[PDB]
Design a protein around this nucleic acid. Sequence first.
RNA 1: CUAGAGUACGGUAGAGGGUGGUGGAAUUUCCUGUGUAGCGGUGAAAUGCGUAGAUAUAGGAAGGAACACCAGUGGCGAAGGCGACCACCUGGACUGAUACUGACACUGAGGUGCGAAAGCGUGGGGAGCAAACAGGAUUAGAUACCCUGGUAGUCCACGCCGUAAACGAUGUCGACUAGCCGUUGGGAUCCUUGAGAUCUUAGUGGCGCAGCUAACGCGAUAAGUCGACCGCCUGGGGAGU
Lengths: 86, 62, 71, 105, 115
Amino acid sequence: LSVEEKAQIVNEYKQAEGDTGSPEVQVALLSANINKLQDHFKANGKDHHSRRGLIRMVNQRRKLLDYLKGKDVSRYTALIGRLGLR
Amino acid sequence: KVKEEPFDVALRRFKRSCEKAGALAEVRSREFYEKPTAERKRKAAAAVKRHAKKVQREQRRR
Amino acid sequence: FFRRRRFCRFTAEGVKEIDYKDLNTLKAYVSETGKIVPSRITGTKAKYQRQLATAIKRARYLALLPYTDSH
Amino acid sequence: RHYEIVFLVHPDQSEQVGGMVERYTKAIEEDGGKIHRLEDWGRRQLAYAINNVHKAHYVLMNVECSAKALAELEDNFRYNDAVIRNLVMRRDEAVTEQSEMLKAE
Amino acid sequence: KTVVDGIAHIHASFNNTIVTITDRQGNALSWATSGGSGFRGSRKSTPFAAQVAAERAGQAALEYGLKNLDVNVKGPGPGRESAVRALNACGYKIASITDVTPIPHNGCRPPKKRR
RNA sequence: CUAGAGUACGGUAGAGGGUGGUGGAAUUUCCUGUGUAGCGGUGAAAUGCGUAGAUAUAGGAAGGAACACCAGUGGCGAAGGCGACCACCUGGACUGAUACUGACACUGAGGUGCGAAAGCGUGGGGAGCAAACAGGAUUAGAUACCCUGGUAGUCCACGCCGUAAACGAUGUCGACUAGCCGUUGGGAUCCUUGAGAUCUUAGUGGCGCAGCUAACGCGAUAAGUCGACCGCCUGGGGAGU
Ligand SMILES: [Mg+2]
Ligand SMILES: [Mg+2]
């Protein structure tokens, strides 16, 4: 993922902060990066050592959602529907 | 390559220049194929014979 | 200490990114037959020895340096 | 970006190579890529035989183009008989001029 | 027939040694082998027998002249340097001596190890 | 709340993957010249190859796979594994500064994946090497070792199989405990010329005190002192049947 494509996302899903630590910043950065790789793995089929890196990012994303659900519900469904998951 | 002036000088300038270049021990290791485990024994035994030589000489360097 | 100064042939100067163009440098590091020297003879640091081996293999490809005494 | 295309031509085409420079670099300017050096090292002797010749004519060139003009010169060198070897490179930096032909004379 | 400044080729295996006198064109003038001198066995591989066959090639070479020789030594076996000292014994000006040795960078794989 | 954990920012190092392309040395087959009696092999020989012109030697063509020297107790990868050069996509680690989130962590029965090599299926491709096999020799005997040949295979695409002395014969994670000599990479401080200096993290090696151990031996990369979860052992054969 590029540098300005990171800066496009942090500007968008900022929690009126200027700050990159909140889960709505972190979940957004991972989800844009999984969608980019899906055509790398339709050309490269036998790329197994890079398949291993993608499953790290998927499992990291389901851990931050349950932390988000384990605190609030209003912040949760305002983020699930804004990305279209589950 | 050795050019030329007596002849015995250019012989010893050729016997030595071949050995100081090589290509005589390398030919001798082309006549039987070593499986790569047996080439990991040269890599194992020669590393022991170098690090032990740096310490056994220190006993002479006492 | 000739093996000590040649370590400083790349580290004392700011010549960190060596090129395959300075043949006057690279001919100091190639033996009379054509094969490449070790790094316990020059004594160069192993960061640059790896970097030195690429500039040989590229200059060899462009026919700037031979391989053997045959051709 | 920031390529360092080096290619050598046939010794019998070293007369014609002056038009061969701009014939390639005009298409790069169509892409939108400026050129930061263009050196001609001249006629030198090889270290060995490449299709049974011994002279050549080295052409040094540093180009900063996008992905289309790289696809141009990748193909044009393959479809020629003047050019006998090439080498495309990549550095992640810019280019200053006048490297070594002063020092090579 | 008259030729000068010939080239001497020396091929030295572990069991036999073959010496050939040629020209710059790569054409045969005189060949001589260690087996043709009548050794045929354990005596065949000795560096002494690489002197008998060396001078015998150097005697049918004076049919054509060849006052100058250029030596290419090729092979791992013994008699690799003993054959050169048996060349100017016949009275030949040896100009330069050159190693030629086929060394593959990777090459085909060799046969298996003996037991 | 920020000490665990994760993000944003500079910055290095690497045979970490996948898709194409291009080299040089050597081997073999073929063509052509010169040239003429053996070559090859071995404790020694023989089978074999040779004037129907071999080996040698020079010129040319085609084709296949491996990638000298660098190369190292050296690197990278979760493990198996990974060495020609370039482009092409692509994963993670290190190191520094700085802001943010504020415990978001650990392990994991079942379940899901990636699995050397030999082998199996359909299609390619056939340089060398080489089980099965054939001949010679050795041999009371020799299916064997040694010699001359030689097929599946090894190579590529797609799919399968799932085991190895799959080894550090040592499950993952966290915290404390004398030292000294090396080495990869990275910041420091420092008089500055250093063949510099000392300190600090992340690896990787050689000795060693306490301590433990049946002994051998490990010893900040524990088999030392302690925690959290899991797997597994119960005399030898019978039998991992
Ligand atoms: Mg293993
Ligand atoms: Mg076990």
